[PDB]
Structure 1
Amino acid sequence: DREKALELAVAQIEKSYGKGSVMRLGDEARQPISVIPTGSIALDVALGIGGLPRGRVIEIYGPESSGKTTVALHAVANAQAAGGVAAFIDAEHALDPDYAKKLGVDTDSLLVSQPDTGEQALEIADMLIRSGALDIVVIDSVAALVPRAELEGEHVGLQARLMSQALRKMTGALNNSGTTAIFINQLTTTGGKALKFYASVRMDVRRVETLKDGTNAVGNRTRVKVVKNKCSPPFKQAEFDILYGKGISREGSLIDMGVDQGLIRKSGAWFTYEGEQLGQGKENARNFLVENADVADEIEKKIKEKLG
């Protein structure tokens, strides 16, 4: 009786409001056709559907130099890598393309708009989404989008009304086109509370601690926290390594989820995969896996097989 009334109830909530309106936190996720891998299996896993969804607004947010921008450029890198077309609306004026190319972005064929207002930024994105040619669009950033009025001189609050209007319209078209939009935001105090509710995924990117290679300390350890997720149970979280100049370590992530899933064995500062030995201490095993793509792809597919 109690279950049937609950499963019935829950089923009607989905009928009238859609997919992830209600979920238990332990539930398995659905499994979409295609998603955009994040660049880290950990964050792919934490997201529950093995990557960022499509036809969705996505908010990545954190403080100055947290990594978010990198996380976003890997979404672009992967979207393109599968022959997708990308776009980048830029209000910050801080994109380093040399760094982008190192993560794997195809800057040469990356669409860039550097608009002159918030009105323009969004209307261009809106116009570009309806072409149905783009897979992903990034908008750096929500803070920098300053409304026409404010730029001309002519009471505040007009930015939040802008973000709200724009999203309502844009939210429709995204689900039709199968495009993904990423808004990068900083820390309606930073723009609009609207993004918070239109977003189907919201990631909280922070910097946990600085990595060090003994002397000459490279990279930072990042921690995304998936505070909202309509495509899968939320409040999951992932840590990974962003290395200066290289970005997210795909290999370093495979090791961590490796040992975690019991596929890899830490004997004693010694990393073992399935009889053979990978290296001595993470930075070796990582630098081994990067030299050997064959063993890297295998580990990835096995962890995925083992989950989704």
Structure 2
Amino acid sequence: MAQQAPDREKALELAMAQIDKNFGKGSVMRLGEEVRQPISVIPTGSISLDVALGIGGLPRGRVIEIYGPESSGKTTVALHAVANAQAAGGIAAFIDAEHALDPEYAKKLGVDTDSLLVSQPDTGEQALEIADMLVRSGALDIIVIDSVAALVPRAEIEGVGLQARLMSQALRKMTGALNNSGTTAIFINQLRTTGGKALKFYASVRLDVRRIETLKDGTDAVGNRTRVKVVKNKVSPPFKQAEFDILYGQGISREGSLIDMGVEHGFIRKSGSWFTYEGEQLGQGKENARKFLLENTDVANEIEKKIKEKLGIGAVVTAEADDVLPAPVDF
């Protein structure tokens, strides 16, 4: 080389060059790197968690894990990422093992329940089997499994080692057909190790979702402020964070997102009372501005785009900005 010399950057690039080469893309990155923008992606439904994932949504053909304490926001997230998939006329499966979906809450989010394949597995060696067997076909686009913690091994539900081995296997047999089909998988996880102590490594994306404040300002408490930290992202630098709202019954607050998200970058101003926009006003009081966007889809689609144009993302317009070495630029 030239050791007892300097750290000059030329050589190090060959390393990575090869590491990404032997272990595949994503094996080594610089946290604040330039992200590789793809074409196919499933928007999560919250602009915030989107750019947080850095690519616009969730990656395809990759397994994603969503763990977190009860009633935090996982399923929704799932349920939304599920609806959007369908917006591109896709087939989405759902493996029930918790027996807790309310097809009508799904209904208000976007889900075309009547098209949604919902299996209710007899045991653990079935939700994984029907999963893969439903996966190897390749007609789907996104398959969801409710709780990695309730997939008890055939043996157990009758008459040690099992669950982790169960996951370890099928998830090895499956991580292989999902990539060769672009079928993205979501594995909800109810944290409160052995089961997902494979999924952990098998996964590409791993979202951590926790409830924060109980959205307060009127009728009683209408929503909940969810934070989400992407502790593992083998498709873009990791450790990013996005916070967002999910109104009871309403779902993840898109509009609400666009505001905090739209000011946190300079497209939307002042706002003592008043949240103005490029000259005109969107209203006084967040909820109100929240109202004006959900009453003016047009203005709403102008702030989601504009923003997705200042930070990459695979899309619609921007058309010139993107390339030639290193930089997020401020916080």
Which band: TM-score by shorter chain?
Answer: over 0.9
Q: Residues 2 and 81 of structure 1: is their aligned pair in 2 closer, same or farther, counting only changes over 3 Å?
A: same
SS in 2 for 1:149: coil
- C-alpha separation in 2, matches of 1:20 and 1:146: 33
Note if contact 1:225-1:237 (Cα within 8 Å) is conserved in structure 2: yes
Structure 2 unpaired stretches of 5+: 1-6, 312-331
Residues in 2 aligned to 1:189 and 1:84: alpha-carbon distance in whole angstroms: 33
Distance 2:218 2:119 in 1: 42
Residue 296 of structure 1: how far off its partner (Å): 0.5
Aligned-partner Cα distance in 1 for 2:190–2:276:
41
Q: Structure 1 residues 101, 22: CA separation in 2 closer, same or farther (over 3 Å shift)? A: same
* 1:207-226 residue CA offsets vs partner (Å, 9 max, x unmatched): 01100233422000000100
Are the aligned partners of 2:274 and 2:285 in contact in 1 as well (CA < 8 Å)? yes
Contact 2:69 2:192 in 1 (8 A): no
* TM-aligned CA deviation for residue 189 of structure 1: 3.3
Aligned-pair CA distance for 1:4: 1.3
Could you report, residue by residue, the CA deviation over 1:135-154 in whole angstroms, capped at 9, with x for unpaired residues?
0000001001000000112x
Query: Cα deviation per residue 1:60-84 (whole Å; 9 max; x = unaligned)?
Result: 0001111101110001000001111
- Matches of 2:218 and 2:164 in 1, distance apart? 47
Match of 2:166 among 162, 187, 197: 162
CA distance in 2, matches of 1:217, 1:235: 30
CA distance in 2, matches of 1:160, 1:211: 37
Residue 268 of structure 1 and its aligned partner are, at CA, apart by 1.4
Output the CA distance in 2 between the equivalents of 1:51 and 1:225. 14
Change in Cα spacing, 1:188 to 1:238, as seen in structure 2 (3 Å) is: closer
> Deviations for 1:72-113, whole angstroms, at most 9, x for unmatched residues?
000100000111110000000000011000111110110010
Where structure 1 has 5 or more consecutive residues not aligned to the other structure, the ranges are: none
> Is the 2:165–2:195 Cα contact (8 Å) retained in structure 1?
no
Aligned match for 2:43, one of 37, 43, 56: 37
Instruction: Tell me the distance in 2 between the aligned counterparts of 1:46 and 1:180.
Output: 18
SS at match of 2:155: helix
Q: Deviations over 1:232-272 (max 9, x none)?
A: 00000000000000110010000011010110002312101
Which structure has greater strand proportion?
Answer: 1
Residue number in structure 1 paired with 2:190: 186
Q: Is the 8 A contact 1:59 1:185 kept in 2?
A: yes
Partner Cα separation in structure 1 for residue 93 and residue 35 of structure 2 = 29
Check conservation: 1:160, 1:188, Cα contact below 8 A. no
* 1:190 Cα offset (Å): 5.2
Identity value in percent: 91
Distance in 1, matches of 2:235 and 2:192, equals 24
Query: Do the aligned partners of 2:163 and 2:194 also contact (CA within 8 Å) in 1?
Result: no
- Number of aligned positions between the proteins: 305
User: Structure 1: how far apart are the matches of 2:147 and 2:20?
Assistant: 33
Q: What is the alpha-carbon distance in structure 2 between the residues aligned to residue 97 and residue 9 of structure 1?
A: 50
- 1:138 matched to 2:144? The reply is yes
Equivalent position of 1:23 in the other structure: 29
Task: State the shift of 1:192 in Å.
Answer: 3.0
Say which of 54, 70, 74 aligns to 2:76. 70
- Which SS does the other structure have where 2:108 is aligned? helix
Contact 1:143 1:190 in 2 (8 A): no
For residues 14-163 of structure 1, the aligned pairs below 5 Å read 14-153=20-159, 156-163=160-167
Q: Report how far residue 188 of structure 1 moved.
A: 12
State the alpha-carbon separation in 2 of the partners of residues 208 and 42 from structure 1: 16
Instruction: Give CA-to-partner distance per residue, 1:118-177, whole Å, 9 cap, x none.
Output: 101100010111111000000001001000000112xx3211000001111101111100
Q: TM-score, normalised by structure 2?
A: 0.90
232-241 or 181-190, which moves further after superposition? 181-190
